[PDB]
Amino acid sequence: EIDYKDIATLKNYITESGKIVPSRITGTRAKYQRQLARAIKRARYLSLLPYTDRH
């Protein structure tokens, strides 16, 4: 299960600018891609991850 606190894992699925990388590029299953997107949005809200690279 994807954890929004697992910043090290989550950083593999974001670009340098902070955007969420497409599953067609990362080879991720769709069901797990949705969980990744939710976790990344939660982490952004908690400021564990940036919304944009201009931070």
Partner 1 sequence: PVIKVRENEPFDVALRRFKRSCEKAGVLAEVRRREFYEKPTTERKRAKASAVKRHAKKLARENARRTRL
Partner RNA sequence: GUCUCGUAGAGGGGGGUAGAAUUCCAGGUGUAGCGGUGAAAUGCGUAGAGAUCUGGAGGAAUACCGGUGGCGAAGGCGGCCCCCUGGACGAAGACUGACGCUCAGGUGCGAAAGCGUGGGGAGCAAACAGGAUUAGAUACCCUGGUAGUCCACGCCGUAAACGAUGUCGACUUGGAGGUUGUGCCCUUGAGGCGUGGCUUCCGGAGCUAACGCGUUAAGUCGACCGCCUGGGGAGUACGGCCGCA
Partner RNA sequence: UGAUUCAUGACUGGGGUGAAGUCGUAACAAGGUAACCGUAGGGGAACCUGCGGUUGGAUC
Site residues, partner 1 (CB under 8 A): 15-17, 53-54
Q: Out of RNA, partner 1, none, which partner does residue 6 contact, by CB within 5 to 8 A per kind?
A: none
Q: How far apart are the C-alpha atoms of 46 and 31, rounded to whole Å?
A: 23
Q: Is 38 in the site for RNA (CB under 7 A)?
A: yes
Q: How far apart are the C-alpha atoms of 28 and 50, rounded to whole Å?
A: 22
Q: Is 11 in the site for RNA (CB under 7 A)?
A: no
Q: Residues in the site for RNA, rule: CB under 7 A?
A: 15, 18-24, 27, 29-31, 33-38, 41-42, 44-45, 51-52
